[PDB]
Design an enzyme around this catalytic site. Sequence first.
Site, PDB file in Angstrom:
ATOM      1  N   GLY A  99       1.373  -7.387   6.722  1.00  0.00           N
ATOM      2  CA  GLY A  99       2.409  -7.759   7.669  1.00  0.00           C
ATOM      3  C   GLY A  99       3.594  -6.816   7.623  1.00  0.00           C
ATOM      4  O   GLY A  99       4.097  -6.382   8.666  1.00  0.00           O
ATOM      5  N   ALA A 154       0.832  -1.197   0.000  1.00  0.00           N
ATOM      6  CA  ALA A 154       0.000   0.000   0.000  1.00  0.00           C
ATOM      7  C   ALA A 154       0.867   1.248   0.000  1.00  0.00           C
ATOM      8  O   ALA A 154       0.624   2.191  -0.763  1.00  0.00           O
ATOM      9  CB  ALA A 154      -0.936   0.002   1.208  1.00  0.00           C
ATOM     10  N   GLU A 165       4.849  22.196  12.544  1.00  0.00           N
ATOM     11  CA  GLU A 165       3.626  22.989  12.516  1.00  0.00           C
ATOM     12  C   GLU A 165       2.380  22.123  12.373  1.00  0.00           C
ATOM     13  O   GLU A 165       1.309  22.487  12.874  1.00  0.00           O
ATOM     14  CB  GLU A 165       3.692  23.994  11.363  1.00  0.00           C
ATOM     15  CG  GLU A 165       3.082  25.344  11.671  1.00  0.00           C
ATOM     16  CD  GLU A 165       3.304  26.367  10.567  1.00  0.00           C
ATOM     17  OE1 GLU A 165       4.417  26.411  10.001  1.00  0.00           O
ATOM     18  OE2 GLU A 165       2.360  27.132  10.267  1.00  0.00           O
ATOM     19  N   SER A 174       0.308   0.586   5.310  1.00  0.00           N
ATOM     20  CA  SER A 174      -1.010   0.046   5.602  1.00  0.00           C
ATOM     21  C   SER A 174      -1.044  -0.487   7.028  1.00  0.00           C
ATOM     22  O   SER A 174      -0.035  -0.967   7.554  1.00  0.00           O
ATOM     23  CB  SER A 174      -1.377  -1.073   4.624  1.00  0.00           C
ATOM     24  OG  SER A 174      -0.580  -2.227   4.840  1.00  0.00           O
ATOM     25  N   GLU A 178      -6.378  -8.517  10.071  1.00  0.00           N
ATOM     26  CA  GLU A 178      -5.858  -7.160  10.102  1.00  0.00           C
ATOM     27  C   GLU A 178      -6.184  -6.410  11.389  1.00  0.00           C
ATOM     28  O   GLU A 178      -5.450  -5.483  11.743  1.00  0.00           O
ATOM     29  CB  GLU A 178      -6.368  -6.363   8.905  1.00  0.00           C
ATOM     30  CG  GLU A 178      -5.828  -6.830   7.570  1.00  0.00           C
ATOM     31  CD  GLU A 178      -6.591  -6.217   6.415  1.00  0.00           C
ATOM     32  OE1 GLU A 178      -6.066  -5.282   5.772  1.00  0.00           O
ATOM     33  OE2 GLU A 178      -7.727  -6.665   6.154  1.00  0.00           O
TER      34      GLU A 178
END
EC number: 3.6.5.-
Lengths: 313, 62, 438, 424
Positions: C144, C12, C254, C140, C183
């Site tokens: 894993g 991802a 910031e 992600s 997950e």
Amino acid sequence: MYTFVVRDENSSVYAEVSRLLLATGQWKRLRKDNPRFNLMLGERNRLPFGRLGHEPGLVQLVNYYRGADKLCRKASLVKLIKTSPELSESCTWFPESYVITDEREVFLAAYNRRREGREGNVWIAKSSAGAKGEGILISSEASELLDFIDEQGQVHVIQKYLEKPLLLEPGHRKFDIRSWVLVDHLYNIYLYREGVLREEGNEMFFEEFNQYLMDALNTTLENSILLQIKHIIRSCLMCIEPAISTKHLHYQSFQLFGFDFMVDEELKVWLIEVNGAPACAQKLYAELCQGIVDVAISSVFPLATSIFIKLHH
Amino acid sequence: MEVIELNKCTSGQSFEVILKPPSDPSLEEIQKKLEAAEERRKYQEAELLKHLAEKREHEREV
Amino acid sequence: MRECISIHVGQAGVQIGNACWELYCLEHGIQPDGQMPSDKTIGGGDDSFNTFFSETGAGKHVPRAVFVDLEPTVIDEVRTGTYRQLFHPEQLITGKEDAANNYARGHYTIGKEIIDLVLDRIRKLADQCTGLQGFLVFHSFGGGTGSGFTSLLMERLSVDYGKKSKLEFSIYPAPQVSTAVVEPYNSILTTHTTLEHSDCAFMVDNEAIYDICRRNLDIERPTYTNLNRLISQIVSSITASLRFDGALNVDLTEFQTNLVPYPRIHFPLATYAPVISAEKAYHEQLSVAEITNACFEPANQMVKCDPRHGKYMACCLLYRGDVVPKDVNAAIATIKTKRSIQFVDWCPTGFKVGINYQPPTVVPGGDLAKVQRAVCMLSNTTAIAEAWARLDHKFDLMYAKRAFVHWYVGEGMEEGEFSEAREDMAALEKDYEEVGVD
Amino acid sequence: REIVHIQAGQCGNQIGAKFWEVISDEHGIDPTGSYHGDSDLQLERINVYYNEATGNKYVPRAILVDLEPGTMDSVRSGPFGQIFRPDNFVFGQSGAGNNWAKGHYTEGAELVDSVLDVVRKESESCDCLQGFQLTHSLGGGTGSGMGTLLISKIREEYPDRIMNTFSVMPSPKVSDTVVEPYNATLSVHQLVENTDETYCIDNEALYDICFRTLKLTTPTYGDLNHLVSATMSGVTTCLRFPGQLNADLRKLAVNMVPFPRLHFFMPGFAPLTSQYRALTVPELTQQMFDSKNMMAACDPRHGRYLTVAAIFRGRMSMKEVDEQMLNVQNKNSSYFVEWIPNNVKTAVCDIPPRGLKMSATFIGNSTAIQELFKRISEQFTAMFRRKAFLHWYTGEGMDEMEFTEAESNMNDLVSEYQQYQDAT
Ligand SMILES: O=C(Cc1ccc(-c2ccc(OCCN3CCN(C(=O)CC4CC4)CC3)cc2)cn1)NCc1ccccc1
Ligand SMILES: Nc1nc2c(ncn2[C@@H]2O[C@H](COP(=O)(O)OP(=O)(O)OP(=O)(O)O)[C@@H](O)[C@H]2O)c(=O)[nH]1
Ligand SMILES: Nc1nc2c(ncn2[C@@H]2O[C@H](COP(=O)(O)OP(=O)(O)O)[C@@H](O)[C@H]2O)c(=O)[nH]1
Ligand SMILES: [Ca+2]
Ligand SMILES: [Ca+2]
Ligand SMILES: [Ca+2]
Ligand SMILES: [Ca+2]
Ligand SMILES: [Mg+2]
Ligand SMILES: [Mg+2]
Ligand SMILES: [Mg+2]
């Protein structure tokens, strides 16, 4: 077909609703904790609203409006009526109320004022935790109340007592009115055309009350009372619509409400309270629950007159 | 509702609008835990291979 | 000029980084070969865009990026893709076999044997930095690698770069879009072990992006490319202040200062509008007031929650395109008069606003249409805790039976870590609740 | 990600030969090993099961094992005989006599090192091996005993590689000898300890499908192996074709096995063949979840699904597929556990199998797989309580104690399934 769960066995109204849903032959009651449901008849405390609408390919409906407790709890109701500009600083239909952000000084000031005016000072102390009869304390002396107020656990609210209520005079009887209102996912406000006055079970239906008004006071339920009732229902529910509406949400909400009113001798309607999990009159469970199924549930999960006044807005 | 601290420039501008005012672990410990996980892995593997050795003893016996 | 390093971890992270650097190159007018004709600063420069690109002697603009995966097909596509010569080989680090959706495998087993190499390749970039702000970490929650190795890398970037901000761009797991079932475990574990090392984390729920692509791009089967291009639209609107002239959010510090008063609660909800299909023949372009209003419809949020039930701690409105302050202020007035926006009693009820006049840049041939104005709103609202609750609940359902736990224990982990991380999550959940309701 | 294939015994070799025929056809490889297909989607993932040889011939990464040369004579002569690497035919001359002891302890031990040599020489030429797949029966001696011994040895040598099996369960309705429940019972224990995934192919189900559904009055082993090869192609589809997810054997196992010992899957396939009608997605899903389409002779309604994976193949609307899947689940949702959220997953492969325009392969990890083990156990006990036929095994060095242990471990496995069937 459609699936639903029941997380509140104690709900008589939604007990009937689930029974009839099953009897339709197109509804499957899952186990309390099954997430793959189309409809939740949820619990009354900590309903997991945050876990709704995240279930792939399921339209999820629930029988409660998140945030509706702002209207269904007397402390919250008082705060909402006082602060929200939608409702006047003192709208003409809610008793002079003070929750004891703490207003002890203000209720003491007004109660001294009425003290010197010598013509009205009966108040009432109550909390959103009144145990189905316990907790109420009417008192001419408000020192009594305040003293025991602090001699009590949770927060309390002090309303101005209805010194001169309407009396069903063939008996010199005090009474309050219960109206049932359904708000569907579109936020249509449907008033149930049958209320009750709290004769058998101390319960009088609207036909009898209407005939009594016609014969004795030469008036009708509609004109004398129900216009005000509809106005108050519409005001209360329209006030909070932006906060609770599920128009553009991942889950949808409908809810049944029970509005408690009482009437003074001048035929002026006052709002007592709003109950978010109301019971129903024994004779009308069958009609009202069928109406709920028709308007709030099958409206979303369609199959293959009206008992409701649509309070347009 | 007051506008505040306005800075501009050839590629934009920024500001603030107000509507109401108000009322770590060391490396040693990362290492000395990754290695603990690795040694747990090694113990599990050792027990596995000793179980296998037991079965080979049994096969020879049979 | 104060450089920033981007670290993309896992599939991802790598693919979203591909999207982000494609969009960055398009926005800065950099070609796939690294040449920037508009850069008259041949060989160097202190320009703001240099915060994300370094310059070679031959006018090549090379991302300050590091791509890392435990298996190489995802990064092999990068190496053989349109922007293959944008990057140089050492930025692309890959292993042989992956973590198989196992947090233990990515953190303990395989992570241990690539971490030193990755940190060396990162130091080689930090050495090319006159002054380093910190890192933007993309990963992600579910994979894993993206969970385990990301948490390891964060733990030890804290040690090696302890005075440098670390910002997260995290993909929150969605069953509709995912191949995995474990997950909740990886998300809880990585969040627990990374929380003290992340100053500000922007969560993106694959469910929200999926439904956004379905509704507003009219795509019944969104690909990872659709979701990733949308995600880079949001990411670019977030990082423009760092890559462009401005006065708001010019420093990674910031971001925290303006959005994170409480270090533990550092997950700002992101809302973005408008998202408009490129297949729309003609579209009635939306006003500053319509897009600012859209910033308060949950259907545009990167995570589906209800900010009405919850309190705000901070708000930034970041506009790109034809926008002027007075239109913004008008819109803010209108919306306050019509929406439920409650702040905590100890934070100003206000909005920090930034405006790039350059309109949004969109990938040619993509599914997003050009628009003369867009906005991204970053609001730290407690309502996002719903996303935690959901996840936690899922965790509780599986761990009650210890389902799949043996896969983690087999790699060296202990159930004690599971329960420790879950209790951290419970503490965070009612930390949100305490700041949030009355 | 390379896979090493091993087929042991008569049933194992026959089913493996059919599997290689099927997938060689799908990948466009001819019996000579030359590619003559018509798409690069056929080749992008071809290194998973084939080595590239001189002249860029493709040779299956398959090791053929038997204790007698018959079936491997037929294999080396059959349709795709000459595609298997000649060195990879490893055989003995005696046989195993449908005796687990001979395959595991006596006759097999004499050849397991020879087999492991070829296994090693195939593994060395692997860029990154993801694991092994074995085809074998549990009711005979070579497949059954020697394959479990091989699995133990492979775990010893490759302790951190995935070991999966397609294991054919015995059944009296289609039986070779009466000692099948013994062999099976002893093999299953081994599998419980030493396989990451075991796809339980029950000949009872295969025979019942070939008879009641395909309407074949006298089914041969070829008719059952047709179904078995179809299922094997379906199961492995996601690894052999490029359009799919990014998961090695380990990732799929991680997401399909919530508990170590409960890794025995129920395969399923639809439609059932041995027609031209375009089959619809709703019919595919309904048949796929129908018990009559499943290879294990168990009723899934007598248990609960821990995890489910479905691989559709063919040109279809993923929207319609995913609506119909959500239908079949949300409808019959009392057979999915509530403590494993979102445990049903679906993949669609744009390439279809041959003969069929739309197919669905069903992999279900259901606690109803009990029903198979109790069946076998019953048969086992029905003989073991009279020591019946034990002389076949005691004569090869086995003790009654071992039979008692094998009986106990499987009764335990049944009990474990009962535990997770009641959980709420
Ligand atoms: O396990 C085997 C057989 C096997 C078991 C399980 C699975 C499996 C299948 C699907 C799945 O989820 C896939 C869902 N997603 C697909 C993408 N989606 C998108 O939306 C894309 C997104 C928008 C951009 C939808 C969701 C997970 C796992 C697959 N196959 N092994 C083969 C083998 C066995 C024995 C010996 C050797 C080999
Ligand atoms: N938005 C988006 N999400 C992705 C993408 N790729 C994977 N994911 C998400 O990541 C989760 C799984 O982690 P992955 O990114 O696939 O893999 P990983 O984190 O690198 O871990 P490994 O697979 O071991 O390498 C899934 O739930 C997906 O939702 C992508 O390209 N875009
Ligand atoms: N599906 C299938 N099963 C078979 C076949 N041949 C034998 N079996 C089953 O497997 C058992 C015999 O195993 P066998 O193949 O002889 O292996 P071996 O005995 O170890 O060599 C019997 O109980 C049969 O039910 C076959 O061709 N197909
Ligand atoms: Ca420059
Ligand atoms: Ca830090
Ligand atoms: Ca001999
Ligand atoms: Ca040797
Ligand atoms: Mg009430
Ligand atoms: Mg990956
Ligand atoms: Mg035989």
